[PDB]
Amino acid sequence: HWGYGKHNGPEHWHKDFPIAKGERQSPVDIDTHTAKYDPSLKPLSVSYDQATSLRILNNGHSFQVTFDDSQDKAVLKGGPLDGTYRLLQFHFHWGSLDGQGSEHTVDKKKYAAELHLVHWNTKYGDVGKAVQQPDGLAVLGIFLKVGSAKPGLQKVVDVLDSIKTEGKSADFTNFDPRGLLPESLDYWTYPGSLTTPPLAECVTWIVLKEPISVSSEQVLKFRKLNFNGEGEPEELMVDNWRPAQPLKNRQIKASFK
Numbered sequence: 001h002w003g004y005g006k007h008n009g010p011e012h013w014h015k016d017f018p019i020a021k022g023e024r025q026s027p028v029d030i031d032t033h034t035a036k037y038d039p040s041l042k043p044l045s046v047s048y049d050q051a052t053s054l055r056i057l058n059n060g061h062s063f064q065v066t067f068d069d070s071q072d073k074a075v076l077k078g079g080p081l082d083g084t085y086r087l088l089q090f091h092f093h094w095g096s097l098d099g100q101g102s103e104h105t106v107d108k109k110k111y112a113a114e115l116h117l118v119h120w121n122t123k124y125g126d127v128g129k130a131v132q133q134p135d136g137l138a139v140l141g142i143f144l145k146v147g148s149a150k151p152g153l154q155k156v157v158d159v160l161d162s163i164k165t166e167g168k169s170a171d172f173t174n175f176d177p178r179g180l181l182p183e184s185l186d187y188w189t190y191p192g193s194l195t196t197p198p199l200a201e202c203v204t205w206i207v208l209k210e211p212i213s214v215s216s217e218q219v220l221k222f223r224k225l226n227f228n229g230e231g232e233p234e235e236l237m238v239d240n241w242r243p244a245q246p247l248k249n250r251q252i253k254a255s256f257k
């Protein structure tokens with residue numbers, strides 16, 4: 001199957017997912033001197049008060065926390081978005097070294113990791129329908145920088161021992177994703193895609209200006225996860241990021257000056 005190694009990684013994906021070479025692929029480099037401030041962009045509305053987390057799981061390419069999206073509990077609205085998008089899951093991408101790991105870059109700078117909070121457009125009824133639409137998903141991307149610890153991440157970090165290998169999952173109820181946000185909601189936005197197969201061109205990307213700070217010990221625990229399943233040769237889950245893709249006929253807009 002696909003992965004992030006030399007024999008199944010991003011340079012190979014197009015052979016099974018030809019949209020990998022499409023017109024609105026993600027991630028991209030955000031050139032801060034080419035992004036345009038758009039004073040028409042509304043502030044984001046992050047309404048996570050009623051979020052209901054369910055499980056945390058190792059799916060062989062990241063770890064993911066899932067949420068009950070059977071009704072408008074945790075939603076993302078405003079910003080560039082029309083209508084209401086429900087939080088479905090979040091997951092991360094990270095590096096083997098602190099100078100790499102993020103998918104988006106800022107002026108070619110790579111961050112140690114990147115958080116993706118994945119939301120789907122309720123007008124399409126279910127997520128499978130949404131992924132077929134150019135405005136079906138909104139992913140809120142947040143950079144992780146190595147510095148002080150992020151207290152709202154520690155509960156995630158402390159359970160990763162229990163989902164070391166692909167296919168493992170654990171209960172992860174009563175987790176508050178608001179603890180993963182930075183102070184500012186200033187953002188860049190552009191139309192793009194999923195950054196993993198199937199690479200569907202269905203995502204409004206909203207990337208926050210302000211990174212969150214996580215400690216070295218927190219990101220070390222990401223790097224102890226495994227791509228493999230139990231009983232298989234161990235392969236550390238590191239460098240699960242796609243590099244920046246051609247911007248092509250797109251403009252990145254900024255909500256701030």
Ligand SMILES: NS(=O)(=O)c1cccc(NC(=O)NCCCCO)c1
Pocket residue numbers: 001002003007008009012013014015016017
């Ligand atoms: N899904 S994909 O990235 O297009 C892809 C393309 C080519 C091979 C793979 N999987 C592979 O196993 N490639 C190398 C073979 C190692 C066999 O044990 C996935």
Ligand SMILES: NS(=O)(=O)c1cccc(NC(=O)NCCCCO)c1
Pocket residue numbers: 059116118139193194195196197198203
């Ligand atoms: N990395 S991302 O653009 O935020 C994103 C968001 C939502 C879905 C995906 N891609 C996938 O879930 N691919 C399915 C992989 C099958 C095993 O879990 C990527």
Ligand SMILES: [Zn+2]
Pocket residue numbers: 091092093116195
């Ligand atoms: Zn992602």
